Amino acid sequence: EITRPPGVRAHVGVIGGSGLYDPGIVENPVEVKVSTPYGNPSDFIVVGDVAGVKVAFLPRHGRGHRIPPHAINYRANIWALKALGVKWVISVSAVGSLREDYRPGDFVVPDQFIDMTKNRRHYTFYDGPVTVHVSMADPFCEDLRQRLIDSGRRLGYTVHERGTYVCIEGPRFSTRAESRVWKDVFKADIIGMTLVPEINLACEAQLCYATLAMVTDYDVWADRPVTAEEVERVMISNVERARRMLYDVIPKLAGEPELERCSCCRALDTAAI
Amino acid sequence: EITRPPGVRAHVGVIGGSGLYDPGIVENPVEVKVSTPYGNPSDFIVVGDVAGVKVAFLPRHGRGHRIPPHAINYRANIWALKALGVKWVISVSAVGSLREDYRPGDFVVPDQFIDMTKNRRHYTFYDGPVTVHVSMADPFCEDLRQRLIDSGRRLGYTVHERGTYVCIEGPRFSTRAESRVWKDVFKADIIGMTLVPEINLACEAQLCYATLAMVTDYDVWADRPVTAEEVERVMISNVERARRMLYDVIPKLAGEPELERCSCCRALDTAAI
Amino acid sequence: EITRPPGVRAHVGVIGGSGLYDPGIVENPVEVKVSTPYGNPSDFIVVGDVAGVKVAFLPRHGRGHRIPPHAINYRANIWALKALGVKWVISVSAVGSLREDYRPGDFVVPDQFIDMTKNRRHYTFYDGPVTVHVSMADPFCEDLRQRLIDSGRRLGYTVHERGTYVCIEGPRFSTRAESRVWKDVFKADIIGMTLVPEINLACEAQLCYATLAMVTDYDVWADRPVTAEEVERVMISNVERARRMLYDVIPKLAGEPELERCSCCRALDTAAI
Ligand SMILES: CSC[C@H]1O[C@@H](n2cnc3c(N)ncnc32)[C@H](O)[C@@H]1O
Ligand SMILES: CSC[C@H]1O[C@@H](n2cnc3c(N)ncnc32)[C@H](O)[C@@H]1O
Ligand SMILES: CSC[C@H]1O[C@@H](n2cnc3c(N)ncnc32)[C@H](O)[C@@H]1O
């Protein structure tokens, strides 16, 4: 609704995770305040240009990693991006691996998730009187997933083309007994803390959302269990590769997502009663 | 405690789910306001007669399906029914199926559940100083389950006589990876969003509660995944069969539940410390 | 920060569960009020001496079992113990068994857990701006676990030396379908309602925390399902054995936990960003 400065619009949104607090990639940056009914987003949104495409960057944890996963205002974040007019949302996330072949340093473009959060307080925008139940059988935007995979291939990086993300509550990491459940019982591939309810809200807002995950650790399975310092060090070490992928992909998003390859682009048509 | 109009009492409660916003079945209807310590129930309770039995009808989603599963005031709803004197509670619900032989249009009378909710805020009436831990090994009222099965058989409808209900948080439907967990790992039969904490509270209030579920969809497993519009269309198409079952069952509930076939009828005797 | 009376300090904390509302074991008892940023702990903390070691006793449910698991102020409880200077925390808990050989009356010293809670509201002390993600691969303090096992052996009691605790939300007990999941799918050994987030917070506070669990029931698996009255009766019947173990262990805790056998003793060094 109201923005300061007024009149600002963007086409692509990038939500940065661990290690990605500044855009790096946007020219002509302007910090924008966007009103939301849910109060403050995680930080200012930075709007600028990448090869003629207008991009909105939001660090989900705020500058300086000030906001842990459970305390993020997910509703304000997604509302703010929608308000600016974005159609595509690239999330960049750090994840743990539950399988030997998904190695630290590899990218993953997941296609499924399992929600094991509990304390995120709001899992939807729709609390009534219009009841909305979106279909999320195929929760990510396939058009954007395929573009991410392609860019990774072209640049010569390893990109695993599928994966189930188990989203846990945190902020503590998993016990060994929990991790055995995620790996051996649920048959999940990667693990993180921030995907839900971000993805739910993106789908309800009819955005084309996909995750570019970077494997930072093997959870509890290496001779040393994951620590926060390790995750951060690995992301910061590799952020340049993530930036090179964004620069490659974003110019190709000048147009609109293909409806037939965007499960949520018309989600509300059959979801609202 | 206080009702408007004053003095109103009922013996059987019917909680209507998706597609069931009006009683249809009650003669001589009166809309009643019932005070609760938890504020407003979902809507007015409609009290009237069915073949000499006094019935209280409550639409859990309110008239017009205004209240999604996560926003229902479950405590107020059950408190209000208890206050009116009801002994039997029939819940009518739409569910998805996780097995080929439980087909859209079939009824199910479940006997078990698995709670995978997270955001319902209150799962009990007892927050202290009397600590209450009810046994829910056999969570539904067997007396009422058997009566529902019998009515269905007599009318010639398909009624599956057992089933495990997995209750999910919503309002979004399951991902494919989640649905594989419910089906192949938990070995659940049906899926919905509204049973918990409704059943918990019913048990704590010493009510004989059972669910008459109607299968509306196959979750993510048919060539088209479930949508909200499909669920609603299927319930509205079949509501007449649900009404015919209620008319058959209710006259037979003139008496009291049999204690030996009512796991929660004396739940508080051994549960309170 | 502020205590009344002023100047009080303790070295060992004991958190008593079901059936353990009074210390029994402390000489020279003083009831202490300890300020916390989170309001009231469950009750007064009782500080006194056991063979020259200063002990702080807190009943997690309050005197008279006034506070159910979901309503405990876990943050205030752990903050208060930390403020008094304690280094070791022994929790005494009632648990159900999911295996024939862990019998009512046996002690268990668990080594793992699985968190299936949902409604505890705060799972950490750290909501920002310092983000903290503690490693809990090995969540209990091994130094204290080994001391508990030793004491049990010396006194001639059965003490199972490992176990996975599944923590459920409650206050209702599990359905049969849930219990089959905990036992046959998760392969958990024991079940309770109070461990989480108590253990999370203990770890974040850099305490050496371990659980001495007493098996009070077989969950839904004996010909009679668990009831609250049974749990309480069994704990009260056996509290004397729990007291004899505490008297044996506490004098041996005059020193400090061994860092190499205390996973959380330096948890914050690698966890904070
Ligand atoms: C900076 S350390 C915390 C971040 O690590 C991410 N993450 C990385 N590895 C894991 C893991 N093994 N388990 C859970 N979250 C992880 C989470 O999404 C979280 O925001
Ligand atoms: C009107 S669409 C929403 C309703 O569908 C019911 N339901 C029907 N099918 C499913 C399903 N497959 N998964 C979850 N809930 C379902 C839920 O209890 C909810 O209130
Ligand atoms: C006094 S009865 C309630 C207590 O029983 C403990 N407990 C004992 N047996 C079980 C069980 N089978 N399931 C869950 N909690 C149990 C819980 O931690 C709770 O605080």
Coordinates of N, CA, C and O and ligand atoms in Angstrom, one line a residue, chain A residues 18 21 61 65 69 93-97 165 168 171-174 191-194 216-220 226-229 231-232, chain C residues 131 133 273, ligand 1:
Chain A
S18 N 21.2 -17.5 5.5 CA 22.4 -17.4 6.3 C 23.6 -16.9 5.3 O 23.7 -17.4 4.2
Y21 N 23.4 -11.2 3.7 CA 22.8 -10.0 4.3 C 22.8 -8.8 3.5 O 21.9 -7.9 3.7
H61 N 17.0 -12.8 7.9 CA 17.5 -12.7 9.2 C 17.8 -11.3 9.6 O 18.2 -11.1 10.8
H65 N 22.3 -10.8 10.9 CA 21.7 -12.0 11.4 C 21.1 -11.8 12.7 O 21.4 -12.6 13.7
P69 N 15.2 -18.1 13.1 CA 14.1 -18.6 12.3 C 12.7 -18.5 12.9 O 11.7 -18.2 12.2
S93 N 19.2 -20.4 0.7 CA 19.2 -21.0 2.1 C 20.4 -21.9 2.3 O 20.8 -22.7 1.4
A94 N 20.9 -21.9 3.5 CA 21.8 -22.9 4.0 C 21.0 -24.1 4.5 O 20.1 -24.0 5.3
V95 N 21.5 -25.3 4.1 CA 20.8 -26.6 4.6 C 21.9 -27.6 5.0 O 23.0 -27.6 4.6
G96 N 21.4 -28.5 5.9 CA 22.2 -29.7 6.2 C 21.8 -30.8 5.2 O 20.7 -30.9 4.7
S97 N 22.8 -31.7 5.0 CA 22.5 -32.9 4.2 C 22.3 -34.2 5.1 O 23.0 -34.4 6.1
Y165 N 13.2 -31.4 1.6 CA 13.6 -30.5 2.7 C 12.7 -30.8 3.9 O 11.5 -30.6 3.8
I168 N 12.7 -28.1 10.4 CA 12.6 -28.2 11.8 C 12.4 -26.9 12.5 O 12.7 -25.8 11.9
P171 N 15.5 -23.2 17.8 CA 16.8 -23.0 17.1 C 17.9 -24.0 17.3 O 18.9 -24.1 16.6
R172 N 17.8 -24.9 18.4 CA 18.7 -26.0 18.5 C 18.7 -26.9 17.3 O 17.6 -27.1 16.6
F173 N 19.8 -27.5 17.0 CA 19.9 -28.5 16.0 C 19.3 -29.8 16.5 O 19.0 -30.0 17.7
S174 N 19.2 -30.8 15.6 CA 18.6 -32.1 15.9 C 19.4 -32.9 16.8 O 20.7 -32.9 16.8
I191 N 17.9 -30.6 5.3 CA 17.3 -30.1 6.6 C 17.6 -28.6 6.8 O 18.7 -28.2 6.6
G192 N 16.6 -27.8 7.2 CA 16.8 -26.4 7.5 C 15.7 -26.0 8.4 O 14.8 -26.8 8.8
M193 N 15.6 -24.7 8.7 CA 14.7 -24.1 9.7 C 13.8 -23.0 9.2 O 12.9 -22.6 9.9
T194 N 14.0 -22.5 8.0 CA 13.3 -21.3 7.5 C 12.3 -21.4 6.4 O 11.6 -20.4 6.1
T216 N 25.7 -27.0 3.7 CA 26.8 -26.4 4.5 C 27.4 -27.5 5.5 O 28.4 -27.2 6.1
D217 N 26.7 -28.6 5.7 CA 27.1 -29.6 6.7 C 26.3 -30.9 6.5 O 25.3 -30.9 5.8
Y218 N 26.7 -32.0 7.2 CA 26.1 -33.2 7.3 C 25.3 -33.5 8.6 O 25.2 -34.6 9.1
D219 N 24.7 -32.5 9.2 CA 23.8 -32.7 10.3 C 24.6 -33.4 11.4 O 25.8 -33.0 11.7
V220 N 24.1 -34.4 12.0 CA 24.8 -35.1 13.1 C 25.7 -36.2 12.6 O 26.2 -36.9 13.5
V226 N 27.1 -30.7 13.4 CA 27.0 -29.3 12.9 C 27.1 -28.3 14.1 O 26.5 -28.6 15.2
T227 N 27.7 -27.2 13.8 CA 27.7 -26.0 14.7 C 27.3 -24.8 13.9 O 27.4 -24.8 12.7
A228 N 26.8 -23.7 14.6 CA 26.4 -22.5 13.9 C 27.5 -21.8 13.2 O 27.4 -21.3 12.1
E229 N 28.7 -21.8 13.9 CA 29.9 -21.2 13.3 C 30.3 -21.9 12.0 O 30.7 -21.2 11.0
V231 N 28.3 -23.5 9.9 CA 27.3 -23.2 8.8 C 27.6 -21.8 8.2 O 27.6 -21.7 7.0
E232 N 27.9 -20.8 9.1 CA 28.1 -19.5 8.6 C 29.4 -19.4 7.8 O 29.4 -18.8 6.8
Chain C
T131 N 21.8 -14.5 17.6 CA 21.1 -15.7 17.2 C 22.0 -16.9 17.7 O 23.2 -16.9 17.5
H133 N 22.2 -21.2 18.1 CA 21.8 -22.5 17.6 C 22.7 -23.5 18.2 O 23.8 -23.8 17.7
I273 N 25.8 -16.2 16.8 CA 26.2 -15.4 15.6 C 25.5 -14.0 15.8 O 26.1 -13.1 15.3
Ligands
LIG1 C1 23.7 -20.1 10.8 S1 23.4 -21.6 11.6 C2 21.6 -21.7 11.5 C3 21.0 -21.9 10.1 O1 21.4 -23.2 9.6 C4 20.5 -23.7 8.7 N1 20.8 -25.1 8.7 C5 22.1 -25.5 8.3 N2 22.4 -26.8 8.5 C6 21.3 -27.2 9.3 C7 21.0 -28.4 9.9 N3 21.8 -29.5 9.9 N4 19.8 -28.5 10.6 C8 19.0 -27.5 10.6 N5 19.1 -26.3 10.0 C9 20.3 -26.2 9.4 C10 19.1 -23.3 9.3 O2 18.1 -23.1 8.3 C11 19.4 -22.1 10.2 O3 18.8 -20.8 9.9

